[PDB]
Amino acid sequence: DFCLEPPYTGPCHARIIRYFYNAKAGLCQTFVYGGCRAKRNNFKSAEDCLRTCGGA
Amino acid sequence: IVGGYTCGANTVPYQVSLNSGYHFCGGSLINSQWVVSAAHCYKSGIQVRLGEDNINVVEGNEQFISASKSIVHPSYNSNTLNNDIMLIKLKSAASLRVASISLPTSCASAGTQCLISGWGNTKSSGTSYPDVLKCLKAPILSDSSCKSAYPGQITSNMFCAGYLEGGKDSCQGDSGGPVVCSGKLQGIVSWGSGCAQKNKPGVYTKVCNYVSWIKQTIASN
Ligand SMILES: [Ca+2]
Numbered sequence: 001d002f003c004l005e006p007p008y009t010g011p012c013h014a015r016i017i018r019y020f021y022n023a024k025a026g027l028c029q030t031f032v033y034g035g036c037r038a039k040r041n042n043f044k045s046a047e048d049c050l051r052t053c054g055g056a
Numbered sequence: 057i058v059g060g061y062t063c064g065a066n067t068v069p070y071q072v073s074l075n076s077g078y079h080f081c082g083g084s085l086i087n088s089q090w091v092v093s094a095a096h097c098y099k100s101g102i103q104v105r106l107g108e109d110n111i112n113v114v115e116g117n118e119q120f121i122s123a124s125k126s127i128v129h130p131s132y133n134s135n136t137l138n139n140d141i142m143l144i145k146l147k148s149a150a151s152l153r154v155a156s157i158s159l160p161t162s163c164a165s166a167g168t169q170c171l172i173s174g175w176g177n178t179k180s181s182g183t184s185y186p187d188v189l190k191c192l193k194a195p196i197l198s199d200s201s202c203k204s205a206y207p208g209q210i211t212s213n214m215f216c217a218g219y220l221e222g223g224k225d226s227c228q229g230d231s232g233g234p235v236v237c238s239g240k241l242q243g244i245v246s247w248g249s250g251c252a253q254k255n256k257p258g259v260y261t262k263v264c265n266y267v268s269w270i271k272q273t274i275a276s277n
Contacts, residue, residue, distance in 0.1 A: 013230050035097060037094035
């Protein structure tokens with residue numbers, strides 16, 4: 001389950017705000033994504049995050 | 057920028073901030089209507105902010121101009137990060153505190169000292185994004201050492217710059233920004249393994265390899 005994976009910033013140096021499902025909190029939170037090599041628990045909006053991972 | 061210093065208001069006049077509701081990448085003004093940045097900084101709805109020092113407060117010297125076109129290198133590979141370069145056309149020409157930087161006539165050699173700038177994280181690890189632009193002087197490293205630090209990941213279009221001891225480096229939020237050596241734009245902040253880690257210098261897009269593509273692309277768009 002990729003929804004239970006911790007957020008991955010990656011090697012690139014941008015500061016792009018994305019969302020990831022935080023299983024502990026039971027909600028989608030924001031994190032800094034570097035711009036490349038994103039894993040699946042990385043969404044552009046909280047809605048996308050909740051639709052895909054909500055309740056995992 | 058980890059381990060750097062405050063540049064000073066408008067002392068790096070070619071430095072721009074790419075804004076999408078917040079600063080997410082840097083870039084360099086290479087023409088009154090064109091900016092060069094990294095391909096991984098590609099985003100829709102980009103607003104380019106010129107003449108910035110404190111990115112959090114309006115100080116009067118700014119020019120906010122929307123991008124009309126964003127051209128990512130046709131051979132950019134998101135997996136290998138090869139050809140990590142992008143051109144952004146401004147919706148209107150910037151009024152030249154705001155100045156363009158020259159493209160290189162030739163590639164720089166290992167040992168060359170360069171100025172790297174940006175509004176990225178200043179902590180190795182931790183988080184601390186600055187208000188004002190930070191600067192860092194770092195030397196270009198040999199292809200041999202760059203390849204030793206990142207086995208099988210360095211292409212002919214990339215170069216390392218920084219210190220093997222760690223402590224001084226680019227970091228999240230600096231991507232797309234300039235590496236000027238020098239008075240010529242030699243690199244674009246691209247990637248690395250963490251920030252300011254020992255034996256893990258930052259990797260930059262080698263601009264001298266794209267000068268013809270840049271000139272022709274700017275001219276036919
Ligand atoms: Ca400002």
